[PDB]
Motif scaffolding. Structure first.
Motif, PDB file in Angstrom:
ATOM      1  N   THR A   1      65.932  10.673 -53.607  1.00 52.97           N
ATOM      2  CA  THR A   1      67.312   9.934 -52.751  1.00 52.97           C
ATOM      3  C   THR A   1      67.721  10.318 -51.740  1.00 52.97           C
ATOM      4  OG1 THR A   1      68.957   9.737 -55.138  1.00 52.97           O
ATOM      5  CG2 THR A   1      67.249   7.792 -54.490  1.00 52.97           C
TER       6      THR A   1
ATOM      7  N   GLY B   1      71.543  10.868 -52.447  1.00 51.29           N
ATOM      8  CA  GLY B   1      72.123  12.194 -53.229  1.00 51.29           C
ATOM      9  C   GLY B   1      71.661  13.262 -54.064  1.00 51.29           C
ATOM     10  N   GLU B   2      70.051  13.107 -54.348  1.00 53.87           N
ATOM     11  CA  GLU B   2      70.315  14.034 -55.556  1.00 53.87           C
ATOM     12  C   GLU B   2      70.048  14.905 -54.186  1.00 53.87           C
ATOM     13  OE1 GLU B   2      65.822  11.523 -56.847  1.00 53.87           O
ATOM     14  OE2 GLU B   2      66.918  11.543 -59.095  1.00 53.87           O
TER      15      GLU B   2
ATOM     16  N   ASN C   1      71.783  14.547 -66.582  1.00 56.17           N
ATOM     17  CA  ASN C   1      72.251  13.992 -65.815  1.00 56.17           C
ATOM     18  C   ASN C   1      72.060  12.346 -66.824  1.00 56.17           C
ATOM     19  OD1 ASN C   1      69.900  11.889 -64.533  1.00 56.17           O
ATOM     20  ND2 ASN C   1      71.396  12.284 -62.918  1.00 56.17           N
TER      21      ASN C   1
ATOM     22  N   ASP D   1      67.196   9.044 -59.104  1.00 57.11           N
ATOM     23  CA  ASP D   1      68.911   9.550 -59.494  1.00 57.11           C
ATOM     24  C   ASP D   1      68.385   9.624 -60.372  1.00 57.11           C
ATOM     25  OD1 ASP D   1      70.204   8.386 -56.874  1.00 57.11           O
ATOM     26  OD2 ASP D   1      69.450   6.557 -57.670  1.00 57.11           O
TER      27      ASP D   1
ATOM     28  N   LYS E   1      71.382   8.850 -65.902  1.00 57.77           N
ATOM     29  CA  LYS E   1      70.413   8.154 -66.044  1.00 57.77           C
ATOM     30  C   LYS E   1      69.320   9.053 -66.578  1.00 57.77           C
ATOM     31  CE  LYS E   1      68.311   5.629 -62.410  1.00 57.77           C
ATOM     32  NZ  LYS E   1      67.129   5.166 -63.272  1.00 57.77           N
TER      33      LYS E   1
END
Ligand SMILES: [Mg+2]
Ligand SMILES: [Mg+2]
Lengths: 108, 108
Positions: free
Chosen positions: B78, B80-81, A25, B22, A27
């Motif tokens: 989130t 998205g996750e 990931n 994220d 981030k």
């Protein structure tokens, strides 16, 4: 190639955390490796080291090899991780990651 | 809710690793938290604890709150996750995560 630029314990730790395929990931990596907390100027120097050029771009096939900038024989990203990474980073949408894309992504 | 099933050291480190929005990755989390190396039987137990029952399913809104099974006041995922998570996990295609879905995904 980040010898002297980032913490060796940090680089080791960021790599350890994504050692398994499909566990990466960006981030998470940026934070752990210690890039997120650096200034945009040092983030730019980090880009330069990776693209070998401040004016350069990181293409998809090179983005796949991202980890190998931090440790030569680190694994390759899988195609899935690369696709996710590119799509998040490529703000200007040229299908690759330049210095502006990069600086925004790290600080995101 | 995993007090006594997983190491507290492991649970805290897994959460630490995805504390930023994220930054979550289920393969990363499952290994760090110590689920990936447990037996399928032990993995099925973990599912009943989360899903409250072996016949249950983890649905979208519940998956959003996945981290709070390990630490009550951990952050919400989130959208998205969560979408990424559900898609990876939902092999039988019913749009939610049952015990077979779970077991296969944890052991992936
Ligand atoms: Mg671009
Ligand atoms: Mg399902």
């Amino acid at each position: 190639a980040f010898a002297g630029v980032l913490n060796d314990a940090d680089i080791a730790a960021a790599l350890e955390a994504c050692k398994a395929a499909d566990s990466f990931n960006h981030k998470a990596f940026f934070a752990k490796v210690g890039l997120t907390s650096k200034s945009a100027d040092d983030v730019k120097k980090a880009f330069a080291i990776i693209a070998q050029d401040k004016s350069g771009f990181i293409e998809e096939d090179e983005l796949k090899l991202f980890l190998q900038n931090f440790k030569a024989d680190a694994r390759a990203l899988t195609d899935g991780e690369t696709k996710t990474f590119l799509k998040a980073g490529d703000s200007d949408g040229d299908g690759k990651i330049g210095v502006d894309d990069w600086t925004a992504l790290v600080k995101a």
